[PDB]
């Protein structure tokens, strides 16, 4: 028995509303780079804590600042003048005081964070040399903790909600949402990079739906070592446009789709989106945590959104992070239920109570025609109760990177 | 012009069963970053104007606050480790005298550092900017791509620097007004003079269930003005009565609970004491775009833009302009009889004049009104505002409107 609430939502689903706007910041976008680093550092520390204590100690590395470097793009080959400066911040448990054993145990927080951040950049930025193109600085607050408190956490019980916070999620994705998401995913896949190496990873996708007309506006950074002139630049744009048109036919078949790329380009004056490294982080743009995608990987002003930044937050006891991920997992499964058209899940914690015993879990369902919500309700409540029972499994999925925070 | 108007047949937020609203006050780490970011942007605007008569490309919407360390105590505590603040972003650092064939550097760094220091002096009465804070600066030169887009039609209508959207809505609900005005009052010079023990790091959350509003306030107390746990208690209760008085003025007809510093533990004397009036001194971090929207609120029950207005230039960054513009438009539409609620979403296309790919308007009508009577009045309001978009830019520079 939990405070789980099911209510029939008698509104039009977003899919059927007249207008929609969705944005996604791809992996190479500076803001998304920071989110990715922030979460990579958290996961790294999680693995660090478990490998010496078999549990996770308190930390929060949801603070990462990317300062744009200096660069000179040029057709055929560009120059990286001065490196990107990334500052790691936040806090983390570093030294454990054991009064009984009269011993101090210090953990490699700073070195782990720097390594984690560096290895993540290596993965997502193909045309960056992290040895020379990036500076990874660290000012993470390294705090202490009594080993008696470590012993209590080693029990690995369900943590108590230390705050009254909330999370929100929904499913399924609309056609527009799915198209914005998969466009970025595909343009950052190994398979496409191999066919069009000029496509950088700093990809920003904006989807506008008007009735059944979807307009995709893409900001795509081009790697200048793969285009020797404006002519080949134009060709990359049109090839990508074709590839995205092909993708739209697989997702939004039935819609009118327009695709626009780097609309601020001036082909004449050769004022175009050219980069040395494939990311505007090299000079054009700066970045930080929590001003991009939500945990479902989208920016959605026609859906509810938490302003809270999930990336880098403690997966153990941070309500916001856990509930936003949890809400989307619950909504996703409920959306698989026969008779469910759209599903919203809102979760609210009770401070002092276990995290998987919320003050209120609101399941709002838009039903398919001729379906009884009261037939769907018991199935929906079981799904929600199932995930809450397996709250620790959700925390595992986060550390293992099975779920996303941006 | 692509203005879209829709009827929205739902309960307005005022009538919905549940609501959650939040505001991070001036002294909150995140709001400090927003405020400094905007201070730097405005200072640079003034500097560029005085030097060339025109605003040059910049975006200083990037400030990182690394929390310091302090040791609060009744009667007066001590700062242990200074707060580290990093000023970042893009700016025109230099210009080229083609005739002399020589680079002329502009005073971006000194302007930015002084602006940040001046702002901190205003919002944190009890901080010592000489020892409690480090202000570093790594603002760099922007790329050649957007300084062109910035310049292509600066004398005409500026071209949008980017493809982004801003959102706005009106009117504010009772809970939203209460959260907003509570913070505004507790951070007014009027109250500070009456109760100097009130720090500026004030976080206010409003939770509504039906017609019951629970207002939860996290309020930093300045330890030099409280001799003991008893004087501390008096400040809590004094403020509590002040907010109750305010709630009677705003929340007429609602049950209003007011909880302050609920995490306090008087037994072990573990309360919200601070030396400087902000949690930043205690390791709380902050950055730009992590808190309030331009309406001054964090609202999961309302549409929001993730664009951080603070620090973005008022010339051609729609992330700033459209978020301000959307709220001005929504405000006027809400004045119309028959309109209960209005939502405005404005989408740009990078390369197009800032005056939109789509201007979206949703209206919740009064139960006995036609949208077709309202729709023409809406599109006119939206058009009039797009026509006078440059006056909005003026209001931002002049600081007649805030970005958080």
Swiss-Prot record, chain B:
Keyword terms: ATP-binding, Magnesium, Nucleotide-binding, One-carbon metabolism, Transferase
Cofactor(s), by name: Mg(2+)
Disulfide bonds listed in the record: none
Signal peptide: none
Catalytic reactions on record: L-methionine + ATP + H2O = S-adenosyl-L-methionine + phosphate + diphosphate
Pfam families: AdoMet_Synthase
Residue numbers binding ATP: 140-145
GO terms for MF: ATP binding; magnesium ion binding; methionine adenosyltransferase activity
GO biological process, one term: S-adenosylmethionine biosynthetic process
EC number, UniProt record: 2.5.1.6
The protein's assembly and partners: Homodimer.
Matches recorded under HAMAP family: S_AdoMet_synth2
UniProt family annotation: Belongs to the AdoMet synthase 2 family.
Name assigned to this protein: S-adenosylmethionine synthase
Source organism of this protein record: Methanocaldococcus jannaschii (strain ATCC 43067 / DSM 2661 / JAL-1 / JCM 10045 / NBRC 100440) (Methanococcus jannaschii)
